Automatic annotation (TrEMBL), chain A:
Gene3D superfamilies: 3.90.1100.10. It comes from the Viruses. One of its GO terms (cellular component) is DNA-directed RNA polymerase complex. This is DNA-directed RNA polymerase beta subunit. SUPFAM superfamilies: beta and beta-prime subunits of DNA dependent RNA-polymerase (SSF64484). Keywords: DNA-directed RNA polymerase, Transcription. It comes from Bacillus phage AR9.
From TrEMBL, chain B:
One of its GO terms (molecular function) is DNA binding. It comes from Bacillus phage AR9. This is DNA-directed RNA polymerase. Residues 291-547 form the DNA-directed RNA polymerase subunit 2 hybrid-binding domain. The keyword Transcription applies. It comes from the Viruses. Its EC number is 2.7.7.6. Signal peptide: none annotated. It holds the Pfam family RNA_pol_Rpb2_6. GO terms for biological process: DNA-templated transcription. InterPro entries: DNA-dir_RNA_pol_su2 (IPR015712), DNA-dir_RNAP_su2_dom (IPR007120), DNA-dir_RNAP_su2_hyb_sf (IPR037033).
Length: 484, 649
């Protein structure tokens, strides 16, 4: 009996496969990912969230005479109910919407309209990575990006220095990153918040005349205006990362200034407005709006994903401070390493709802001289029970099941693609760097299986891979650069 | 790039944790990367074989792969107990089963086919489930039904073992070509199952293709096989003129719309949208009136069978059972109208599932494990193929001959190692078979296994000493008949070069086989073969005169997708450089005449068609006319829309 011996010899193996990794798709729950997308809509002050849940669907049909309509083809769906409380001065409407989402049958595929569809993992960088002359951080909808430009400065004695200035390329504009803090917390507020208020001082012309001569070498004095001078320490100026703040601060100011205008927030709030709106009448008001938007760029999911400590995760300002403190180390890191990449399965499926909600909320954010309640109602008025299914199928988010063999473990169960929504990969872009290999690939990915149609856009996970638990599908637990 | 320095071979010792999809292919540390990377795609495209066999040289890794692939077999999650089983058709029937640990209820449905994709599928080898009957007990590890790949004892297999040799046959193996004996072609097989959706309206009728007027069999029966590759043909009927149209329904007419398919019909299902009272009287719509009724009967059965279960106080049912119960109770009710593609059709529409076995034919492709891809060129009767007629074992005949020219040029020496291993296995097996009692026979085996894979010797000894005398004798007879399996791992643990040298040196009584009418020593081994998806009938196309586009140029028509025609009647376009390469010859007027009379001018096309049809068939002397072409008119209209015109002189 050859077969009995073969079975015994197979059972006496030692390098068994990883059971947990293969049967993973059924562990994911839609309700876990549903919350951040709904909470995104909270930008409008009136709208308040109330949660969402899965509704029961089991029911025994009772005989009826109502000319019922039934479909020829079979499909499996599941009902999700969301609730919102729209509150106004007198109206306190409650809106309950229902959405259909496909259910995972046999733990592997969806069945829609008699056809079978296989979900696939997507591989993407964790964030805070580096691109050509820029440092970018991925986000749900708004990709905040920092851009650096070299500049030249001359001191009092005439020594020339070349430094760097950083701008936040947000809202299709180039704006210094210090003016946001100067508008929010103020001059002294920003100085205290950064922690450099003990090293930065501003002196007038009369104080410049009475400047400490013996402290000139110890404390380098830099020009601000024709009369106002800046007092800063050379020891603080030693580090380039520290010098970044000095360069940006000197770049922010202009020739025209007033001593009492420095302590006034409006003095540069109107400057930011003029940067945004050219008309003088609204220079204040429009600027205020931007500030509000700048406090809602970051959402909860990006907070949960990031691996930084709690102290550097309070809000957008703390994130910007932590990013700008360690600019050099972050820009010195590479990109192709696998230590800072993750895999998504459902967040790239729930895209159309987020897109629709953003499109709806922008319209009501840009409304003027009208009643808000009607527009807020129109935001939620259109919710089709076949919205998600139609948008998913039409845009080809899911991949059609076209296989002929019964060997499915290596073919479709473990397959990852770098293309799709928010994918830097693009055939016409001709980015040959992304299609290459890195020494970190070995041990956690397949170096052989590649699609012949387009190399590098499809591989296969190693069956022996052990994803660490409680890390939200992270290959490692620490970034490539320790930063410690 | 100095990033390689992080990689250290000290930790990657004795563990295959860095291989994906290469676990199946053995001796992976010999072939290059360019040929190895083709194996992944080759495994991705591999159709099912009827007579699947486990590989002779196994990597000890395919068993777990087969176990963890749940797309081909279905086992029992928990211990069940059969409650009831009901029939639906000649073959397909369902059964309702109940747990013994939770009280829930589930259903299991027996089938005879599966639609993997638009063309390819397989047939369920449902044997254990059929034996289950009359309130039996299902255990945890039992498997209900399985695909054709899996064998009796869960051992995987995705190919066949064929006797092979490296030889040249009348230059028929140039480039990548393979000859194959008739017996091997008989051994190799494939399956094919397809679904066809025919449609019938109120005006249309069905011709009496099968049977006489007594039995107006419009379509084949449940288990019969179709003939002439025509499943059913429907003819439009008009109220105004039907006296001279419906005189004889036993023959095809000029304006017909037949449906083409091939195979054996296994499953049908009919959905109707007309009142039954109007359908009861029509004589030509007879067979449908049969099947529909039968179908409804089945539904009624379930409504009278388990209505005490779901409608009772327990209600502990799974989602699948409840959904199926609601779906089946939908039909027996009244005033129900179906819809298709978000539209309400008028006449009834059915479904057909057709199964067929396709044998190996010229033009197909077969490849080995190491990506030595080839193409079948010419099959021969087994008599013509080379045979050995001098040695002790006269009679062995090679089944496939491979190209010997491109073995070293292709940079993949694994095939030679595999063939040498199988040849040494053949020699040692014959030596063992010649003489020796069971007391020492196993020793003759063990020695050979001692110099190939040291890990296998311990398991060999344990298994051999575990059994008793009769089973040991049966196992020895079986290994004598089929052959000694040899195991070696892909990357870490295998034979290289020094081991082969020592193995050759130790056995001094081995010489090449001397064939007949060859005068050159030759070796024949056994190699693993897997079929591929690529077929000649999936891309062949021809076109005489199909439907024309709205503008007037020929265009692709969607009829082959709905099984309304045999060939994919798609024209081939002339590319940008094709016209220039044709213009390589100094003649240009002939090119212009050909293009204009083929796909530009309607009057010229009609004149050519007529002049070709009527006249002299042996010798043709057509004379084209001069009429302004369509493309010139299109261009003139577009340019005069822009505001510019092309003026001669």
């Amino acid at each position: 009996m050859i077969s009995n011996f073969r079975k015994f010899h197979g059972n006496k193996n030692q390098e068994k496969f990883n059971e947990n990794l293969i049967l993973n798709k059924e562990n994911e729950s839609i309700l876990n990912y549903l919350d951040p997308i709904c909470k995104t809509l909270e930008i409008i002050p009136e709208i308040t969230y109330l949660g969402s849940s899965v509704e029961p669907i089991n029911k025994v049909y009772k005989f009826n005479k109502e000319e019922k309509t039934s479909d020829i083809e079979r499909s499996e769906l599941q009902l999700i109910k969301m609730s919102f409380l729209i509150e106004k001065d007198d109206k306190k409407e409650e809106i309950n919407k229902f959405i259909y989402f496909p259910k995972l049958i046999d733990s592997q595929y969806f069945i829609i309209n008699g056809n079978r569809y296989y979900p696939i993992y997507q591989l993407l960088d964790s964030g805070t990575y580096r691109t050509n002359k820029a440092l970018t951080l991925k986000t749900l909808l708004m990709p905040i990006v920092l851009r650096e430009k070299k500049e030249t400065f001359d001191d009092i004695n005439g020594e020339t220095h070349t430094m760097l200035n950083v701008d936040l390329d947000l809202f299709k504009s180039k704006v210094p990153f210090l003016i946001y803090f100067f508008s929010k917390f103020g001059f002294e507020g920003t100085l205290e918040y950064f922690g450099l208020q003990d090293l930065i001082h501003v002196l007038m012309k009369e104080d410049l005349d009475q400047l400490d001569e013996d402290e000139i070498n110890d404390n380098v004095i830099f020009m601000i205006t024709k009369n106002i001078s800046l007092v800063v320490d050379k020891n603080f100026f030693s580090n380039k990362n520290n010098q970044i703040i000095i360069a940006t601060l000197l770049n922010c100011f202009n020739t025209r200034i007033k001593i009492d205008k420095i302590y006034e927030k409006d003095y540069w709030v109107k400057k930011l407005g003029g940067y945004f709106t050219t008309n003088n009448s609204n220079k204040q008001e429009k600027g205020e709006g931007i500030i509000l938007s700048f406090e809602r760029i970051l959402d909860e999911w990006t907070k949960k994903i990031l691996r930084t400590e709690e102290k550097n995760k309070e809000d957008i300002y703390s994130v910007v401070r932590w990013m700008i403190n360690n600019y050099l180390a972050l820009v010195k890191q590479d990109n192709m390493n696998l230590a800072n990449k993750r895999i998504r399965l459902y967040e790239y499926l729930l895209h159309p709802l987020l897109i629709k909600f953003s499109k709806g909320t922008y319209r009501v954010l840009n409304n003027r001289n009208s009643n808000k309640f009607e527009k807020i109602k129109t935001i939620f008025s259109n919710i089709q029970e076949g919205f998600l299914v139609k948008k998913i199928i039409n845009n080809e988010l899911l991949r059609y099941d076209n296989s002929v063999n019964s060997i499915s473990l290596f073919t479709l169960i473990l397959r990852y693609t770098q293309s799709g929504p928010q994918s830097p990969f693009s055939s016409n872009s001709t980015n040959n760097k992304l299609r290459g290999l890195h020494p970190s690939y070995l041990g956690r990915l397949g170096l052989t299986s590649t699609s012949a149609g387009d190399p590098g856009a499809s591989g296969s996970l190693t069956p022996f891979l052990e994803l660490p638990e409680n890390s939200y599908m992270h290959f490692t637990e620490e970034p490539e650069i320790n930063l410690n | 790039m100095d990033d390689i320095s992080v990689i250290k071979n000290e930790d990657y010792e004795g563990s295959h944790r860095f291989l994906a999809e290469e676990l199946l292919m053995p001796n992976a540390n010999k072939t290059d990367g360019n040929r190895s990377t083709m194996f992944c795609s080759h495994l991705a495209q591999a159709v099912t074989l009827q007579k699947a066999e486990p590989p002779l040289v196994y990597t000890n890794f395919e068993n777990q792969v087969g176990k963890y692939s749940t797309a081909g077999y279905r086992k029992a999650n928990s211990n069940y107990k059969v409650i009831e089983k009901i029939y639906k058709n000649d073959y397909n029937y369902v059964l309702i089963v109940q747990d013994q640990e939770t009280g829930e209820y589930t259903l299991f449905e027996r089938a005879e086919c599966e639609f993997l994709t638009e063309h390819y599928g397989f047939q369920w080898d449902n044997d254990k489930i059929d034996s289950l009957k009359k309130d039996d007990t299902i255990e945890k590890d039992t498997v209900l039904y399985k695909n054709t790949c899996y064998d009796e004892n869960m051992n995987f297999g995705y190919g066949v073992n064929l006797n092979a040799a490296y030889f040249s046959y009348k230059n028929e193996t140039l480039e990548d070509a393979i000859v194959i004996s008739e017996s091997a072609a008989k051994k190799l097989g494939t399956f094919s199952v397809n679904k066809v959706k025919v449609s019938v309206n109120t005006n249309d009728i069905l011709l009496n293709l099968y049977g006489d007027n007594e039995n107006y069999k419009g379509f084949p029966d449940i288990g019969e096989h179709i003939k002439n590759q025509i499943i059913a043909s429907r003819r439009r009927f008009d109220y105004n003129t039907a006296l001279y149209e419906l005189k004889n329904l036993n023959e095809m007419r000029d304006s017909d719309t037949p449906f083409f398919a091939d195979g054996k019909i296994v499953d049908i299902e009919i959905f109707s949208n007309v009142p039954e009272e109007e359908l009861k009287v029509q004589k030509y719509n007879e067979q449908v009136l049969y099947y529909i009724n039968k179908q409804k009967e089945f539904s009624n059965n379930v409504y009278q069978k388990l209505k005490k279960i779901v409608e009772g106080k327990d209600n502990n049912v799974s989602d699948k059972l409840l959904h199926f119960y609601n779906n089946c109770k939908m039909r027996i009710d009244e005033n129900i109208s179906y819809t298709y593609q978000n539209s309400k059709f008028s006449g009834f529409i059915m479904e057909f599932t057709i199964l067929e076995e396709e044998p190996l034919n010229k033009g197909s492709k077969i490849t080995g494990r190491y990506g030595n891809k080839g193409v079948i060129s010419k099959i021969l009767p087994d008599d013509q193929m080379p045979t050995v007629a001098e040695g002790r074992f006269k009679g062995l005949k090679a089944d496939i001959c491979l190209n010997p020219l491109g073995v070293f040029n292709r940079l993949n020496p694994s095939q030679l190692i595999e063939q040498e291993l199988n040849w040494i296995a053949k020699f040692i097996r014959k030596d063992m078979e010649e003489a020796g009692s069971n007391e020492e026979k196993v020793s003759i085996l063990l020695d050979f296994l001692n110099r190939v894979n040291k890990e296998e010797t311990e398991l060999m000894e344990e298994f051999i000493n575990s059994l008793n005398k009769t089973e040991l004798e049966e196992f020895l007879n079986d290994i004598i008949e089929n052959g000694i399996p040899i195991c070696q791992k892909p990357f870490f643990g295998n034979i290289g070069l020094d081991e082969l040298w020592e193995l050759y040196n130790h056995y001094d009584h081995i010489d090449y086989f001397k064939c007949e009418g060859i005068s050159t020593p030759l070796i024949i081994g056994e190699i693993y073969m897997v079929r591929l998806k690529h077929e000649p009938h999936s891309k062949f196309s021809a076109r005489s005169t199909s439907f024309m586009n709205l503008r007037g140029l020929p265009a692709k028509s969607k009829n082959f997708k709905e099984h309304k025609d045999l060939y994919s009647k798609t024209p081939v376009r002339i590319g940008n450089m094709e016209i220039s390469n044709l213009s390589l010859t100094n003649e240009m007027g002939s090119i212009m005449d050909m293009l204009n009379s083929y796909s530009n001018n309607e009057t010229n096309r009609r004149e050519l068609i007529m002049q070709l049809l009527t006249g002299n068939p042996f010798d043709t002397n057509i004379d084209l006319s001069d009429v302004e072409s369509g493309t010139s008119k299109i261009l003139k209209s577009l340019f005069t829309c822009l505001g510019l015109s092309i003026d001669d002189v």
